[PDB]
Amino acid sequence: QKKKVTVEDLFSEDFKIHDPEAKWISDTEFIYREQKGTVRLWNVETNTSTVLIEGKKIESLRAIRYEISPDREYALFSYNVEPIYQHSYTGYYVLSKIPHGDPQSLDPPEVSNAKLQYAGWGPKGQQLIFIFENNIYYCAHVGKQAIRVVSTGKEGVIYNGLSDWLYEEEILKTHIAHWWSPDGTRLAYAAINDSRVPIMELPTYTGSIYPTVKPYHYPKAGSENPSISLHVIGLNGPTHDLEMMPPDDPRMREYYITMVKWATSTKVAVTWLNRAQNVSILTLCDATTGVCTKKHEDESEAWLHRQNEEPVFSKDGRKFFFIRAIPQGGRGKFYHITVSSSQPNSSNDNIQSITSGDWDVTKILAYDEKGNKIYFLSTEDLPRRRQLYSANTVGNFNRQCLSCDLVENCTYFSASFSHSMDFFLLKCEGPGVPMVTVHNTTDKKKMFDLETNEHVKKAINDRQMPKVEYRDIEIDDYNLPMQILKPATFTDTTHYPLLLVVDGTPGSQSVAEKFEVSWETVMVSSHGAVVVKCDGRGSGFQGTKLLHEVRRRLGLLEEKDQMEAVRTMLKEQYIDRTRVAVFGKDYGGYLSTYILPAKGENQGQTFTCGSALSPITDFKLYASAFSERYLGLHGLDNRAYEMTKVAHRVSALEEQQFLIIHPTADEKIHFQHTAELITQLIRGKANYSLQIYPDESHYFTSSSLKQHLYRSIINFFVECFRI
Amino acid sequence: QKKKVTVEDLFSEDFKIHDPEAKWISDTEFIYREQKGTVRLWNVETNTSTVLIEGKKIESLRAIRYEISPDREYALFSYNVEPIYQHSYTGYYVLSKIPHGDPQSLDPPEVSNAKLQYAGWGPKGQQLIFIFENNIYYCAHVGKQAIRVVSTGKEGVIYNGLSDWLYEEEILKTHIAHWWSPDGTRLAYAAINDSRVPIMELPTYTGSIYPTVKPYHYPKAGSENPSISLHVIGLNGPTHDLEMMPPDDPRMREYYITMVKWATSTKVAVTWLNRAQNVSILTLCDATTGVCTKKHEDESEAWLHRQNEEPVFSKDGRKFFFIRAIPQGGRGKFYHITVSSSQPNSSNDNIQSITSGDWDVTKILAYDEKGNKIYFLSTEDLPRRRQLYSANTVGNFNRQCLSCDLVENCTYFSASFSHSMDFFLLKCEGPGVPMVTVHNTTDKKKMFDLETNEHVKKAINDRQMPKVEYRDIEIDDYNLPMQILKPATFTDTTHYPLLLVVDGTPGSQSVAEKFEVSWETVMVSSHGAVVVKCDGRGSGFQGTKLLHEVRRRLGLLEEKDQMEAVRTMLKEQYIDRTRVAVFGKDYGGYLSTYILPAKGENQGQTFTCGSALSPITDFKLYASAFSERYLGLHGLDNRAYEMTKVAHRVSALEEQQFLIIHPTADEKIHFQHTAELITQLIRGKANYSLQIYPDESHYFTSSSLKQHLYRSIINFFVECFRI
Numbered sequence A, B: 001q002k003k004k005v006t007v008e009d010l011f012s013e014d015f016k017i018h019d020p021e022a023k024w025i026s027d028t029e030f031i032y033r034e035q036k037g038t039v040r041l042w043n044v045e046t047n048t049s050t051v052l053i054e055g056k057k058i059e060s061l062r063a064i065r066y067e068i069s070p071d072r073e074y075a076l077f078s079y080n081v082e083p084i085y086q087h088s089y090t091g092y093y094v095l096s097k098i099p100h101g102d103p104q105s106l107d108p109p110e111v112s113n114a115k116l117q118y119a120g121w122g123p124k125g126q127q128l129i130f131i132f133e134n135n136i137y138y139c140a141h142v143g144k145q146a147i148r149v150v151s152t153g154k155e156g157v158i159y160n161g162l163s164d165w166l167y168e169e170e171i172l173k174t175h176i177a178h179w180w181s182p183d184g185t186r187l188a189y190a191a192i193n194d195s196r197v198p199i200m201e202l203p204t205y206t207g208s209i210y211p212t213v214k215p216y217h218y219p220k221a222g223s224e225n226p227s228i229s230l231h232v233i234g235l236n237g238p239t240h241d242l243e244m245m246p247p248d249d250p251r252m253r254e255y256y257i258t259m260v261k262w263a264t265s266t267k268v269a270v271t272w273l274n275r276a277q278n279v280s281i282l283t284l285c286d287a288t289t290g291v292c293t294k295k296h297e298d299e300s301e302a303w304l305h306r307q308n309e310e311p312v313f314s315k316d317g318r319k320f321f322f323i324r325a326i327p328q329g330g331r332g333k334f335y336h337i338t339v340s341s342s343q344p345n346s347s348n349d350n351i352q353s354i355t356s357g358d359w360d361v362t363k364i365l366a367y368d369e370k371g372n373k374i375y376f377l378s379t380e381d382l383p384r385r386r387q388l389y390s391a392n393t394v395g396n397f398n399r400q401c402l403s404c405d406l407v408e409n410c411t412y413f414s415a416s417f418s419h420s421m422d423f424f425l426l427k428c429e430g431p432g433v434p435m436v437t438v439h440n441t442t443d444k445k446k447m448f449d450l451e452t453n454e455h456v457k458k459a460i461n462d463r464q465m466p467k468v469e470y471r472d473i474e475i476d477d478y479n480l481p482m483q484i485l486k487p488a489t490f491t492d493t494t495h496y497p498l499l500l501v502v503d504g505t506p507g508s509q510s511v512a513e514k515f516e517v518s519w520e521t522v523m524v525s526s527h528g529a530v531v532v533k534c535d536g537r538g539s540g541f542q543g544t545k546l547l548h549e550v551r552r553r554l555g556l557l558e559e560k561d562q563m564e565a566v567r568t569m570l571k572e573q574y575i576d577r578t579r580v581a582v583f584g585k586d587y588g589g590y591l592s593t594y595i596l597p598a599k600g601e602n603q604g605q606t607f608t609c610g611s612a613l614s615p616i617t618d619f620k621l622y623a624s625a626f627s628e629r630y631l632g633l634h635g636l637d638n639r640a641y642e643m644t645k646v647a648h649r650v651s652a653l654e655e656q657q658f659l660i661i662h663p664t665a666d667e668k669i670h671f672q673h674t675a676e677l678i679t680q681l682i683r684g685k686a687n688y689s690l691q692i693y694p695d696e697s698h699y700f701t702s703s704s705l706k707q708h709l710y711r712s713i714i715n716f717f718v719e720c721f722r723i
């Protein structure tokens, strides 16, 4: 009847969602970040959305990033930013006054127009720091000249203020590794030493006539990890730099610092996780002593999970709210909020959780000390959803679900409260087209809409959007969610081809009510096929027990859980056994290539064709922090790294078409994996096909490229599908 | 009716030809190298084939190579752990006495069980040398301890006695670069300096956890070439090392030494070719003076060809027989034998050729000074054949064709004469199953058979061998030969798919009556398809004019010549326009990917699918010696390297399937080419498919691998063929 979703549509200015990136500045107003060019400043109390910056950003060579100072008198702009790893704000930095006019290059002292690794504003006034060649420079006053506060930096070897590869990609999940005290007087920063970490060479084939390798420190499983230390310096006066000394538990001689936050302007909280990732230690250090005191500690049989977890302290640095796994009677433990006094005394804990049940809390948003309110997101509704809740810090702990069925057509949520909990920004993300709204904490009434994305709502309604469907299945005391997407003009007579899209990274979640549109949408819409996603054991958001089911068995269970979801889908009559395919990327590529068998024996050849994008195929060749977490430390050969090798599985492979896609200069999952895999396919005399992306990184931060990628992928399955 | 030729057959112990590798030791007997294990020693005069070595070679960890000493009292052996046998004479060597028993490791002085880069026997006695870490060691007596005669060697940078990459692959065509004087008193050796040659890094993805690149000197077009010098040392007494000084012709400031041979035990012949390869200088040097004297010189407009050409001298070092291009009236010049006195005096040449015509002489085999006989191979019969001839060095120069229709069922030939021309070994090579015979020079009578390969003759007769067919076509004053292979059970009703197999390396020859069986045979036999080969301009064995037609036009003409051969084949009715495919490897892969167009416009899409194995795609990235030879020197940008880029052609590509096969650690044609090519396929939004061979070299010296290769190739075409 009307237009099917096509790839062009995917990259259409029509289907582009616009995130206002709203951010509170006070307890009465939020930034009202770019509406579609200009940057405003809404004032919820008395609708006064002033103008802070305008389409003069386009002027500054389309500054990719920008940040208004605290005193709201300047703005920090970055342009010609080039991406490094996951997230890497690293380009040219310019400063300008709030209304408009007169930009200025932010360069270190004595150096000309040079790229910076990071800029960003301080907490108070217009203080700011910027990192150049791994050294931290500071400027209190905008006119003041920069001062090199820390100078032990050494490009690619000694990082301070920013993460090294492993810290950004695996252990800290951010490139930023420094933290200002609340009063902007002291600055805490991690100092990472990759000096003794092995160096991986990345192959190049396109640069000059004689391409050369790009080296960088990357620790494979078992090798030496980056050595880290936490430091703090004064931002006024001689600045005495002090290192925050770590605990002692002999079960913490090799560790990662996974979390650091200021409890007050004198004390800073730190979580110390040991390399084996089975022992954790929360700590309060004196930013003037360097003495850290144990404030709690956890240990697990498998591996500690969710360790970047930031605690919420009471303005007086007194008691605080953390969140961890608590037994929850039977059926593993779940993540819930917990309370402890500021000065936990050696004997026992102040232990006592605020929430409980067989559901996980996923994010503490705020603590209203003036009474008993603690806002957060949870899976209490359905693990596939995200609702905003609130509980009483006192007596009862009654949970009131603020979102739940408010602003309908969407059940996935994110939100932030004003600097007084009064109001809060609330964003959808699904199931319906995403949007941003504003409410007053108490009332819960939509004070107004910030972004509705009508463009998108229109365009979507002009297309045969796929039809969603959730069908919890189950193995053992576990129920595995699994959403199935149907062609939208789905009947029951016709038989459709099955496309299993598997991720399966332990801890992640593939079945959720978020709003997404990718090449999968195109496959369902434009080429009419049903896609199936399922979250087996190892999945997150369903308690420790489920999660840890894959310990030292990476890729074994998930093969069964996935095959079981395929089988139950094969039983239906609106799907024909002959056209079954599988796809997966990253850890998903591993599972993807792991799942190309034949169930039973007489009933062989379950899949027709499969594909893996940047597949990991040997955890011996993968990042320490990841492999060791699920298979335990290597060295003395934990011999879990042997049976998990996907090589053992390709031995089968009889008639399936195998398409491997892999960007050549992949810094996360080295092309080395794909290379080793193909070697096996060759010895095993199997048939494969490779598509390469010469000198390309792991992420695909190019609409142009991402597009080509998708097209390639759809062109593969769509082929081994039509008959 | 009976078995079709299959891949298994190809690698069957049944279809394996056995080359006795017969080699004369005197004027009455040849080695009778391995009959199928044991090594004998036939005595043609009185049938006495003694036994020199036996299946005791299998003993010595299956020595891959072996060589009996001159005094026939010892035997050199060589094996390779991690078996791979190009024949870079590198591995572990052992010495043993002629009958049998007691092997001994040949290691340098003071070093233990270590690999050697080369061994080999001297001319007289049992003298021998061996190269270790690019230094030459000498042992006169078997018991004598080695002496490091030359010690300026530096692994991978300073080679002496052996070629560096470029010298082995392109300019000398051998890894061996040393030559003993006839009397074993003086030793000449090339000293190659790659010190200032750029170093190419080869990507590795499989070795250790952290793969690393493998570096080595490789000169791309325009870069600095290896610097060479010729040296001579005495093998008895203090050994004064002397360098043979090169000429002066300012048109020889940058040169390659392409040929060196001893004229006597005091004089050595050297051919000096300049980098541009358009000026050549034959020279006689005094192995005791170092003074080289011009003895002749050639220059061409295009490029000199066949420069490794060794001259044949009269026992008294007097007059000699060379072979070069001589005008031959009209229609270019052809290669024929030439005579000159030993001491050519400055004025004019002793010039006067012995043979002439529109055919090429391809190899001087011997000179019988006792009269007037000069034996050689030629294309005088048909360029697609090789017959043994003879001519009179005196008065007439009458050519008598010794082979021609002798031992029928085969017209391709190779041969060698005893150390007195009396008898001669004669080997087939085609068209019928290969074999080795023995005749007495005068008589021409088959004294007996040395190797008949009945196994093969049997097995072949049990199979539906493809049917051969030659069909000279023509463009301009040139007739382009083109053999076509038919399915053997070929009718005329049925329509067959066309498989154009193109090589096209300038100077080479693809259409010849040699006996070959590869995946092409399987394609014709087992999958019934007709393959077509054609030799357009640039081909060899048909005079200078034809050859040089491609100068600075690499890939242009050959596209037309090839397309024309395809068209004339398309006209037939036993072939259907719908299933036309093309394949090529190396320079053939270049042409292969160059030929994926549509003739005319309305009659587009000439090919359905094509494939290129290790395709060169940019002569700027190829070996200097090769590119510069056909496109002229680079540097000041000869801008022929731009239009020849295959990139310009892939722009078309609309519906064809493109399968690129490339071994990753290819040292001859860098994977870099395939990488650059794919980048273009991506920008041009074309469809391709890559098959890689992780860490594999360029050659495929593994039956196991070679097999997988073939299978892969047949599996591709056979697919886009069946309907």
Ligand SMILES: *[C@@H]1O[C@H](CO)[C@@H](O[C@@H]2O[C@H](CO)[C@@H](O[C@@H]3O[C@H](CO)[C@@H](O[C@H]4O[C@H](CO)[C@@H](O)[C@H](O)[C@@H]4O)[C@H](O)[C@@H]3O)[C@H](O)[C@H]2NC(C)=O)[C@H](O)[C@H]1NC(C)=O
Binding pocket: A653, A654, A655, A685, A686, A687, B715, B718, B719, B722
């Ligand atoms: C890698 O790919 C190879 C081909 O690209 C695969 O080889 C085929 O493997 C099958 C099964 O092992 C072989 O048996 C087949 O049996 C079928 C009937 O039983 C035949 O199919 C019929 O229809 C096809 C449709 O195209 C026709 O082409 C065919 O002529 C026939 O009439 C098959 O042809 C064949 O008998 C088959 O021989 C193989 N095919 C070919 C041409 O290689 C291989 O399995 C894959 N994996 C590996 C190498 O292990």
Ligand SMILES: *[C@H]1O[C@H](CO)[C@@H](O[C@H]2O[C@H](CO)[C@@H](O[C@H]3O[C@H](CO)[C@@H](O[C@@H]4O[C@H](CO)[C@@H](O)[C@H](O)[C@@H]4O)[C@H](O)[C@@H]3O)[C@H](O)[C@H]2NC(C)=O)[C@H](O)[C@H]1NC(C)=O
Binding pocket: A047, A048, A049, A447, A448, A449, A450
């Ligand atoms: C500051 O906060 C304001 C809070 O009101 C905000 O205004 C928002 O609220 C009003 C009303 O609550 C929204 O009203 C709009 O939408 C409704 C329903 O679509 C319309 O109602 C009816 O429309 C019919 C037409 O069929 C008309 O005939 C009826 O008389 C009736 O009005 C309204 O007409 C109106 O369009 C308003 O949309 C909403 N604002 C947004 C866009 O979110 C203020 O916007 C805000 N101050 C600023 C700076 O705008």
Ligand SMILES: *[C@@H]1O[C@H](CO)[C@@H](O[C@@H]2O[C@H](CO)[C@@H](O[C@@H]3O[C@H](CO)[C@@H](O)[C@H](O)[C@@H]3O)[C@H](O)[C@H]2NC(C)=O)[C@H](O)[C@H]1NC(C)=O
Binding pocket: A715, A719, B653, B654, B655, B685, B686, B687
């Ligand atoms: C790369 O491969 C893709 C598919 O693997 C090629 O796409 C195909 O291109 C044709 C036309 O170029 C599409 O249209 C066809 O039109 C005829 C009408 O004459 C019709 O009979 C066919 O049914 C077909 O619709 C074809 O649909 C399309 N295939 C798909 C579904 O993608 C592409 O041409 C190749 N090279 C490129 C990208 O240029």
Ligand SMILES: *[C@H]1O[C@H](CO)[C@@H](O[C@@H]2O[C@H](CO)[C@@H](O[C@@H]3O[C@H](CO)[C@@H](O)[C@H](O)[C@@H]3O)[C@H](O)[C@H]2NC(C)=O)[C@H](O)[C@H]1NC(C)=O
Binding pocket: A152, A158, A193, A194, A195, A196, A227
């Ligand atoms: C990672 O970065 C740190 C700095 O954050 C590096 O520190 C340097 O470590 C070397 C040792 O490898 C020190 O040199 C040694 O000094 C001692 C003096 O006691 C001397 O005996 C040795 O011969 C050697 O010279 C160096 O002083 C130190 N840099 C300074 C001055 O702070 C560290 O090496 C890197 N990785 C690690 C943990 O080794």
Ligand SMILES: *[C@H]1O[C@H](CO)[C@@H](O[C@@H]2O[C@H](CO)[C@@H](O[C@@H]3O[C@H](CO)[C@@H](O)[C@H](O)[C@@H]3O)[C@H](O)[C@H]2NC(C)=O)[C@H](O)[C@H]1NC(C)=O
Binding pocket: A276, A278, A279, A299, A300, A301, A302, A632, A633
């Ligand atoms: C969390 O994982 C760590 C890492 O395995 C566990 O710690 C222990 O690590 C040490 C490594 O020094 C292992 O010690 C071994 O103990 C045996 C005892 O006979 C000794 O003979 C060996 O020489 C070696 O010292 C030990 O295997 C390992 N413990 C475990 C889990 O087996 C830590 O205990 C784990 N925590 C839990 C219970 O989750």
Ligand SMILES: *[C@H]1O[C@H](CO)[C@@H](O[C@@H]2O[C@H](CO)[C@@H](O[C@@H]3O[C@H](CO)[C@@H](O)[C@H](O)[C@@H]3O)[C@H](O)[C@H]2NC(C)=O)[C@H](O)[C@H]1NC(C)=O
Binding pocket: A408, A409, A432, A433, A461
């Ligand atoms: C949640 O609320 C939205 C509104 O914010 C709902 O929008 C409605 O979406 C349906 C799609 O099923 C629209 O239907 C279409 O109407 C047009 C009328 O021109 C017709 O041409 C199409 O064939 C189709 O029937 C409907 O117009 C729209 N309602 C309006 C007018 O606002 C939405 O359905 C709800 N859930 C979601 C996200 O689907």
Ligand SMILES: *[C@H]1O[C@H](CO)[C@@H](O[C@@H]2O[C@H](CO)[C@@H](O[C@@H]3O[C@H](CO)[C@@H](O)[C@H](O)[C@@H]3O)[C@H](O)[C@H]2NC(C)=O)[C@H](O)[C@H]1NC(C)=O
Binding pocket: B152, B158, B193, B194, B195, B196, B227
């Ligand atoms: C390739 O190999 C040769 C040897 O066969 C290299 O010879 C070395 O050349 C360097 C110059 O690049 C010499 O060093 C210089 O020596 C002069 C002597 O007066 C001195 O004044 C300079 O300060 C410098 O040290 C070096 O002596 C020589 N090696 C020896 C001792 O034999 C040659 O350099 C390599 N390729 C080329 C042409 O550079």
Ligand SMILES: *[C@H]1O[C@H](CO)[C@@H](O[C@H]2O[C@H](CO)[C@@H](O[C@H]3O[C@H](CO)[C@@H](O)[C@H](O)[C@@H]3O)[C@H](O)[C@H]2NC(C)=O)[C@H](O)[C@H]1NC(C)=O
Binding pocket: B047, B048, B049, B447, B448, B449
């Ligand atoms: C030394 O030289 C001998 C001289 O010929 C070898 O003999 C060979 O030649 C004879 C005849 O010329 C062959 O005759 C037999 O085979 C043919 C083949 O069909 C028959 O038609 C004929 O009736 C004979 O039966 C020998 O077979 C042939 N021998 C070989 C193997 O070549 C003689 O063999 C050789 N000395 C040795 C060591 O055998």
Ligand SMILES: *[C@@H]1O[C@H](CO)[C@@H](O[C@@H]2O[C@H](CO)[C@@H](O)[C@H](O)[C@H]2NC(C)=O)[C@H](O)[C@H]1NC(C)=O
Binding pocket: B045, B440, B441, B442, B443
């Ligand atoms: C190969 O041919 C030679 C001739 O070169 C044969 O030997 C004699 O040749 C002369 C001609 O110069 C004849 O007059 C003799 O009659 C030949 N010998 C005889 C009687 O056969 C020789 O026999 C052949 N091969 C060998 C040397 O065995």
Ligand SMILES: *[C@H]1O[C@H](CO)[C@@H](O[C@@H]2O[C@H](CO)[C@@H](O)[C@H](O)[C@H]2NC(C)=O)[C@H](O)[C@H]1NC(C)=O
Binding pocket: A422, A440, A441, A442, A443, A445
């Ligand atoms: C957020 O919006 C609601 C409007 O519905 C406000 O609620 C009123 O608050 C006053 C207290 O200042 C009460 O006395 C009224 O009874 C409330 N109105 C009613 C009847 O709903 C609220 O004031 C707004 N923001 C906040 C938190 O004050």
Ligand SMILES: *[C@H]1O[C@H](CO)[C@@H](O[C@@H]2O[C@H](CO)[C@@H](O)[C@H](O)[C@H]2NC(C)=O)[C@H](O)[C@H]1NC(C)=O
Binding pocket: B276, B278, B279, B299, B300, B301, B302, B632, B633
């Ligand atoms: C063979 O080629 C060389 C170079 O290509 C010719 O020598 C000259 O080399 C210089 C480089 O310094 C060029 O500038 C000249 O243009 C070259 N001469 C020519 C061909 O114009 C050499 O003469 C060539 N031989 C011939 C005549 O073909």
Ligand SMILES: *[C@H]1O[C@H](CO)[C@@H](O[C@@H]2O[C@H](CO)[C@@H](O)[C@H](O)[C@H]2NC(C)=O)[C@H](O)[C@H]1NC(C)=O
Binding pocket: B408, B409, B432, B433, B461
């Ligand atoms: C060349 O001669 C051989 C003899 O060595 C011929 O052999 C015959 O080959 C056919 C194959 O078509 C077989 O059917 C016959 O049985 C063979 N003859 C016998 C019985 O020996 C051969 O035909 C000729 N050409 C080639 C190489 O095929």
